[PDB]
Write a protein that binds this ligand. Sequence first.
Ligand SMILES: O=[N+]([O-])c1ccc(O[C@@H]2O[C@H](CO)[C@@H](O[C@@H]3O[C@H](CO)[C@H](O)[C@H](O)[C@H]3O)[C@H](O)[C@H]2O)cc1
Ligand SMILES: O=[N+]([O-])c1ccc(O[C@@H]2O[C@H](CO)[C@@H](O[C@@H]3O[C@H](CO)[C@H](O)[C@H](O)[C@H]3O)[C@H](O)[C@H]2O)cc1
Ligand SMILES: *[C@@H]1O[C@H](CO)[C@@H](O)[C@H](O)[C@H]1NC(C)=O
Ligand SMILES: [Co+2]
Ligand SMILES: [Co+2]
Ligand SMILES: [Co+2]
Ligand SMILES: [Co+2]
Length: 434
Amino acid sequence: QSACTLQSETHPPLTWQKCSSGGTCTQQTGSVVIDANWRWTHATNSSTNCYDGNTWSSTLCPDNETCAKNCCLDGAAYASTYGVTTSGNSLSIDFVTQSAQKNVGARLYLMASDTTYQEFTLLGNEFSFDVDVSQLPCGLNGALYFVSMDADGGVSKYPTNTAGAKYGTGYCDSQCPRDLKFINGQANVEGWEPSSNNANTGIGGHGSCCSQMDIWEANSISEALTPHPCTTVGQEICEGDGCGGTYSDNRYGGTCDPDGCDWNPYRLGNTSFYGPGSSFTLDTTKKLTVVTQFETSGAINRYYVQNGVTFQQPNAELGSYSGNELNDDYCTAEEAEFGGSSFSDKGGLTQFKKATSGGMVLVMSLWDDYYANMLWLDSTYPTNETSSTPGAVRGSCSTSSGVPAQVESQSPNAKVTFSNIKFGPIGSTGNPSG
Ligand SMILES: O=[N+]([O-])c1ccc(O[C@@H]2O[C@H](CO)[C@@H](O[C@@H]3O[C@H](CO)[C@H](O)[C@H](O)[C@H]3O)[C@H](O)[C@H]2O)cc1
Ligand SMILES: O=[N+]([O-])c1ccc(O[C@@H]2O[C@H](CO)[C@@H](O[C@@H]3O[C@H](CO)[C@H](O)[C@H](O)[C@H]3O)[C@H](O)[C@H]2O)cc1
Ligand SMILES: *[C@@H]1O[C@H](CO)[C@@H](O)[C@H](O)[C@H]1NC(C)=O
Ligand SMILES: [Co+2]
Ligand SMILES: [Co+2]
Ligand SMILES: [Co+2]
Ligand SMILES: [Co+2]
């Protein structure tokens, strides 16, 4: 796609800290940009929609190439259309925003410049952020994560993409998502099927795969930490059901692991660690700090801070595994006790280290789940299982919770605030901000 300017594009500023092994931190100035899927896509030479509701213009978009040649992405009114605001080091995303139309959630990228994404090399480093999940009920996900996206949004590889990172192009993740409207500088109108339960979305003939570090998928009830490896580290198109992921009838596709090696302390048996109010170790009615460390072995370490008290990731015992480090022993024990082979089949933490060795883009989002009602995060899943099934129970939410139409109607003013991002060598991010 190209870019049009019927609506101005002003990225909300966002600062973050870069810390050094020598004990100091330096303020960095960036901004956030909304993903291309949330934007108005219209004809380059008029106001005619290329995409409207959950259907493409059959005249502007008769095939993927012609569509991209005829169509552009336009600017975003971040606050008034999308409920996205920033203040210094703080980003807030509102769940439902009513303007001329109804918007649900947002997916945003941290920028280095007004035309490029920030790339972070996680290996050997740690990432800290503060989060307020108090206004996230059952069925919502305030997500902070990394993906192996191109810094330019794909412009250098795909000449027919001239909108780039400035307009939120080039998304990929471990679901190899087929809901994207543009992949590799072409539309996704070929094979498009509208969603039966979402007036604004559908599933195309292509998807966009890449490695994914899910640092944080959470609400006020449950939280999870999940690396996902792919056989190709970086952004790669996939065809139809070969994509696997949420958007394919067969979840287990050819290149990415859509399950990951997940760590949810509730799922692992500690139902008292994280939840709303003073009966939990971490009280989700109050802001908390989350620190994630990528040791050069390829293992992942985690600790939390609230009201000046530090907690390592809680210990878990699972088969022969015992500890709080996410390592090959944990991931292998998890497959043996909870089932599945996706993570190991796609090369496990060894393959995942190929992604953290390189650059990855920071994503912050808020979404509800039109496929599985977020039950995998915060409830019993599958819903016919009980606590006698190892791993079935992931949080205290009813298996009835998280119907999109219901949570959109009942909790439209749900929101997530991410703040005080700090990045640097392992051990550096608890030092004074600059
Ligand atoms: O030692 N520490 O590092 C430490 C100790 C206590 C503590 O308490 C939390 O402090 C924050 C910030 O002052 C509180 O949040 C604010 O509370 C206000 C209540 O009127 C209002 O809602 C503000 O918007 C909100 O940010 C929080 O309730 C405390 O538990 C933090 C750190
Ligand atoms: O018996 N088993 O082996 C079995 C049966 C069902 C099942 O459900 C999967 O659980 C995983 C771990 O929670 C779920 O994965 C996640 O999917 C999210 C949305 O796509 C997001 O990708 C997370 O980061 C990821 O872990 C998966 O959706 C369930 O189908 C697991 C095992
Ligand atoms: C849950 O983890 C916290 C933090 O490590 C610990 O203090 C508490 O004892 C744990 N409770 C259970 C039931 O494991
Ligand atoms: Co608001
Ligand atoms: Co995931
Ligand atoms: Co094709
Ligand atoms: Co270690």
